[PDB]
Amino acid sequence: YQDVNCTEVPVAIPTWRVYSTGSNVFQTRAGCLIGAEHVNNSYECDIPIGAGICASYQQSIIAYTMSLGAENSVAYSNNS
Amino acid sequence: IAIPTNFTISVTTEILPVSMTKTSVDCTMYICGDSTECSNLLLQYGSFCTQLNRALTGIAVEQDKNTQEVFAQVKQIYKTPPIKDFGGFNFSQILPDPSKPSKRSPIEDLLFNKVTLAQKFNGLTVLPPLLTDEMIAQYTSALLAGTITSGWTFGAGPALQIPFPMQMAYRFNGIGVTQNVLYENQKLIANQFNSAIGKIQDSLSSTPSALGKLQDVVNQNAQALNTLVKQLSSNFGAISSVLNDILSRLDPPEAEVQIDRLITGRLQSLQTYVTQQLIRAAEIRASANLAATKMSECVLGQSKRVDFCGKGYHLMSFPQSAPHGVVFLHVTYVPAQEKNFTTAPAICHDGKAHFPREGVFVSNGTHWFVTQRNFYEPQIITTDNTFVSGNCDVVIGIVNNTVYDPLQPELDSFK
Amino acid sequence: LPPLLTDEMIAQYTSALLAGTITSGWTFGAGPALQIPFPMQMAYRFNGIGVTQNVLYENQKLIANQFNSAIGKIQDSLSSTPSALGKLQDVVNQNAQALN
Amino acid sequence: IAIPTNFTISVTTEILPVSMTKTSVDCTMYICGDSTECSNLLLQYGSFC
Amino acid sequence: QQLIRAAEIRASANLAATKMSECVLGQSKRVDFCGKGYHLMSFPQSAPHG
Amino acid sequence: YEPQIITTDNTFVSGNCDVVIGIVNNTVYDPLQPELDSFK
Numbered sequence A: 001y002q003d004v005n006c007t008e009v010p011v012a013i014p015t016w017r018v019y020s021t022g023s024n025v026f027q028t029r030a031g032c033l034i035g036a037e038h039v040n041n042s043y044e045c046d047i048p049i050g051a052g053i054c055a056s057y058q059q060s061i062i063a064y065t066m067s068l069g070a071e072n073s074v075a076y077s078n079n080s
Numbered sequence B: 001i002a003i004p005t006n007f008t009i010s011v012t013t014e015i016l017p018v019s020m021t022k023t024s025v026d027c028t029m030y031i032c033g034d035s036t037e038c039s040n041l042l043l044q045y046g047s048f049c050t051q052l053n054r055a056l057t058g059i060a061v062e063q064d065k066n067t068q069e070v071f072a073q074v075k076q077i078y079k080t081p082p083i084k085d086f087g088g089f090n091f092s093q094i095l096p097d098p099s100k101p102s103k104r105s106p107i108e109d110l111l112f113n114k115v116t117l118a119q120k121f122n123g124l125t126v127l128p129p130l131l132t133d134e135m136i137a138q139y140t141s142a143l144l145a146g147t148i149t150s151g152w153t154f155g156a157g158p159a160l161q162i163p164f165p166m167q168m169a170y171r172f173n174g175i176g177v178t179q180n181v182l183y184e185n186q187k188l189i190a191n192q193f194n195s196a197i198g199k200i201q202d203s204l205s206s207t208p209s210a211l212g213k214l215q216d217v218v219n220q221n222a223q224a225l226n227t228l229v230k231q232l233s234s235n236f237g238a239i240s241s242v243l244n245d246i247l248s249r250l251d252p253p254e255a256e257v258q259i260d261r262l263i264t265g266r267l268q269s270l271q272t273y274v275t276q277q278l279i280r281a282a283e284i285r286a287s288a289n290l291a292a293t294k295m296s297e298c299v300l301g302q303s304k305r306v307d308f309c310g311k312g313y314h315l316m317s318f319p320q321s322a323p324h325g326v327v328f329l330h331v332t333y334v335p336a337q338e339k340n341f342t343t344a345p346a347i348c349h350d351g352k353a354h355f356p357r358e359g360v361f362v363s364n365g366t367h368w369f370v371t372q373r374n375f376y377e378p379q380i381i382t383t384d385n386t387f388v389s390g391n392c393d394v395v396i397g398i399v400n401n402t403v404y405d406p407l408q409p410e411l412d413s414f415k
Numbered sequence C: 001l002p003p004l005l006t007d008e009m010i011a012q013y014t015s016a017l018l019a020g021t022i023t024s025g026w027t028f029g030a031g032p033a034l035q036i037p038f039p040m041q042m043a044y045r046f047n048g049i050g051v052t053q054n055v056l057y058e059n060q061k062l063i064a065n066q067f068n069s070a071i072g073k074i075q076d077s078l079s080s081t082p083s084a085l086g087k088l089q090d091v092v093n094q095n096a097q098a099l100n
Numbered sequence D: 001i002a003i004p005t006n007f008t009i010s011v012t013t014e015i016l017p018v019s020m021t022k023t024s025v026d027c028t029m030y031i032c033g034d035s036t037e038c039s040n041l042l043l044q045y046g047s048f049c
Numbered sequence E: 001q002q003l004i005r006a007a008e009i010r011a012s013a014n015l016a017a018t019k020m021s022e023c024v025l026g027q028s029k030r031v032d033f034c035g036k037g038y039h040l041m042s043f044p045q046s047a048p049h050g
Numbered sequence F: 001y002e003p004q005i006i007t008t009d010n011t012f013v014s015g016n017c018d019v020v021i022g023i024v025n026n027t028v029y030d031p032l033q034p035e036l037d038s039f040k
């Protein structure tokens, strides 16, 4: 649901009742996603959502914060 | 001829917008405004509504690709070493500041504060960008760390570390000035670099209209949105500009005409707005492509194209994020303090002509010397730095002189 | 609306650029303009495409004659053929037709 | 292998437009043309001009 | 129509400025960017609208 | 990476030793001394 402080999805509107006021709710900047489980990990970006959040399919659908890339560091010494 | 004897390092600012504000308009709600009769009447007109929605969505998608092409160009994310010993150089202005909210560098903070910026309307909406400001800052920091520690090697293959003064020596050797010029003047170069970067912040802060380009985009987009909103309250040749009065005060049969007039007017206004947005988006896309090219060709490597990055002989560059664009800090080499000499195309010794391998023949009045072409450094003429070709008759401006053989003294001493 | 820059000032810019590039070489685009004789500038420019300086200093007359001949032929080539300046006239015609 | 033994110096022209002709059209005068009734009627249409 | 034509003319003017800066003000090593062959130099001449 | 023995043909002399920082000592072979000694 786009840009809604979703405390009122059932009022806002069969099988739709599963995706209306479900067991999983996660408020984001772009709205809130129903039917996906939040994850503390971070992977590459599948189907985007907004504000640096990409949903994906692992089963189940997971919403996570995007990961830019693998961390790296070069051993910099003044004579190497 | 006139050869300079001294140089100056300068830093120049460049600003290029790379993105717009993603937006979408409720096509049916804007024209109708939650009315059943209006929707029923609009159903006759066909599929203009879907066309407008598809065009706006296509415009909104491309901004994310613009940002992705401009910034996301490094496979990995690099990190600056905890200890900073760069041979006398100072990067505290561009590198991220740890003891600070968020992670923006002081120059980025100044840029974000300088730009002056948004509401909810009837059918209009704004979609948040795919990449937040922190991620763009992380991209810029990764690029900056990679170019500080590795050079241009991190844009081709695996990153390979190298001391900074050696990288700068390579970059002078890349414009026809030997390494010893930097290696014998390291402290002065460091001082000039630090002073130029320090002056950049004051130059940005003093003039209020320094940006002038990222603000115009915001102003004109806001003007377009405001005039689109204001177009809603117009008679358009109808009895009234509000549907409720027409519906209530008048019966339907001669009210469909007024409703149709209002629908035609609002549809025309929306179509004009969409067309203008399409043209502006094309312009912004061209600018973003140019910015991506400048990134890839100047930040990730030294450029030989004249006046592409800064005015002068290009050295290297530093990106900085901006609210809806990117800022470049081109570092260039500019000579100064020139004085004239007298030349000659060739030197005639032993009946044969001689030409310089790298440089020119000059003399300060009596004695001839070979020097470079961008820094006056005389050298004694020997066989090592000249090559012979043909006789002296064919060349026009030959002169009378001698060239020494370094082997002769040793050979005479040791038979 | 009249143009901001009259044709005389545009000609003055072009003349300044031309004088700078004949006299000072490419230096006037980097910093202060620096003197250099023209045959040495062409020696630099041959050296810049992988050809040593020998060819020019021993063939100065030939290159000068070919340069003069080519410049002379340019006038005839762009004058005799009527359909040379096509893009400019096309733009003017398009604007005039749309306004009409 | 092949290696040239002689060269020719040649020049070539190239043409690029850089500017259009500046122009402007008055919306009210074009649409109405010295008529107060037309101007009053057009005032309702909004701010297209 | 005028807006679209003006955008095209702006693109052409940008290309002309790039050619001026890259070839009049210095030698260029991009192939076939300035002429057909190994580029040496260039000279600008004005025109009515170009 | 193809290392080579430092001689006087791949290096050029410039200036004095103390002006530059980071200098290190080594020897630089001269390709003429052997044949010079071969003809005493």
Ligand SMILES: *[C@@H]1O[C@H](CO)[C@@H](O[C@@H]2O[C@H](CO)[C@@H](O)[C@H](O)[C@H]2NC(C)=O)[C@H](O)[C@H]1NC(C)=O
Binding pocket: B005, B006, B007, B008
């Ligand atoms: C080249 O320019 C630099 C600065 O642009 C000169 O450095 C100055 O030299 C004066 C005279 O000795 C002293 O005040 C300082 O050493 C420098 N001053 C500043 C403000 O930097 C330098 O002397 C010039 N010449 C050479 C050969 O380097």
Ligand SMILES: *[C@@H]1O[C@H](CO)[C@@H](O[C@@H]2O[C@H](CO)[C@@H](O)[C@H](O)[C@H]2NC(C)=O)[C@H](O)[C@H]1NC(C)=O
Binding pocket: B364, B365, B366, B367
């Ligand atoms: C031209 O330059 C040369 C070298 O730079 C000068 O030769 C030296 O000049 C100084 C000062 O006059 C003398 O102390 C040296 O003995 C000269 N060198 C030798 C090998 O004798 C020369 O004087 C300059 N000529 C000018 C400036 O007219």
Ligand SMILES: *[C@@H]1O[C@H](CO)[C@@H](O[C@@H]2O[C@H](CO)[C@@H](O)[C@H](O)[C@H]2NC(C)=O)[C@H](O)[C@H]1NC(C)=O
Binding pocket: B396, B397, B398
């Ligand atoms: C550079 O120009 C000067 C004059 O501007 C040339 O000096 C002349 O050289 C010719 C050589 O045949 C003499 O016959 C003249 O008498 C000289 N003129 C004067 C006023 O002395 C000089 O030759 C030119 N240099 C080159 C390499 O062509």
Ligand SMILES: *[C@@H]1O[C@H](CO)[C@@H](O[C@@H]2O[C@H](CO)[C@@H](O)[C@H](O)[C@H]2NC(C)=O)[C@H](O)[C@H]1NC(C)=O
Binding pocket: B348, B392, B398, B399, B400, B401
């Ligand atoms: C440079 O030196 C050469 C060699 O000494 C000069 O050549 C002489 O020129 C005179 C001029 O009439 C002749 O009479 C001599 O016979 C020449 N000598 C030889 C060995 O050929 C030359 O004039 C000098 N100046 C230049 C080349 O400009």
Ligand SMILES: *[C@@H]1O[C@H](CO)[C@@H](O[C@@H]2O[C@H](CO)[C@@H](O)[C@H](O)[C@H]2NC(C)=O)[C@H](O)[C@H]1NC(C)=O
Binding pocket: C062, C065, C066, D005, D006, D007, D008
């Ligand atoms: C290289 O080409 C030029 C012309 O393209 C040749 O110059 C011509 O030479 C013939 C015979 O000497 C003359 O009849 C012509 O008048 C010359 N033309 C010009 C424009 O000077 C030159 O001979 C060629 N080089 C070689 C080595 O054959």
Ligand SMILES: *[C@@H]1O[C@H](CO)[C@@H](O[C@@H]2O[C@H](CO)[C@@H](O)[C@H](O)[C@H]2NC(C)=O)[C@H](O)[C@H]1NC(C)=O
Binding pocket: F025
């Ligand atoms: C760098 O090399 C020079 C000579 O190669 C070293 O000079 C030595 O100086 C000491 C006394 O100061 C003498 O006893 C030696 O005979 C000199 N030569 C050598 C080969 O040792 C110089 O000391 C070296 N640099 C440093 C920092 O030690």
Ligand SMILES: *[C@@H]1O[C@H](CO)[C@@H](O)[C@H](O)[C@H]1NC(C)=O
Binding pocket: A005, A007
């Ligand atoms: C959304 O509701 C929650 C709790 O009611 C709270 O975060 C806040 O009141 C709302 N957030 C908004 C309106 O941004």
Ligand SMILES: *[C@@H]1O[C@H](CO)[C@@H](O)[C@H](O)[C@H]1NC(C)=O
Binding pocket: A038, A040
């Ligand atoms: C991990 O996930 C849980 C449940 O979503 C959340 O409460 C917690 O803040 C997350 N982070 C850490 C560090 O536990």
Ligand SMILES: *[C@@H]1O[C@H](CO)[C@@H](O)[C@H](O)[C@H]1NC(C)=O
Binding pocket: A074, A075
């Ligand atoms: C070798 O290089 C790696 C990084 O490539 C660095 O971590 C390590 O400390 C270096 N070791 C030595 C002995 O130079």
Ligand SMILES: *[C@@H]1O[C@H](CO)[C@@H](O)[C@H](O)[C@H]1NC(C)=O
Binding pocket: B090, B091, B092
């Ligand atoms: C770099 O400049 C800043 C300017 O305030 C200064 O505080 C800092 O000490 C400088 N860096 C070093 C290594 O001295």
Ligand SMILES: *[C@@H]1O[C@H](CO)[C@@H](O)[C@H](O)[C@H]1NC(C)=O
Binding pocket: B340, B341, B342
């Ligand atoms: C340098 O130029 C000045 C005048 O521009 C002239 O008087 C002087 O002689 C020139 N220097 C030399 C070495 O010819």
Ligand SMILES: *[C@@H]1O[C@H](CO)[C@@H](O)[C@H](O)[C@H]1NC(C)=O
Binding pocket: A078, A079, B085, F021, F022
């Ligand atoms: C490199 O850094 C170390 C410690 O900062 C210092 O002792 C050493 O002299 C430096 N190397 C050079 C060539 O200055």
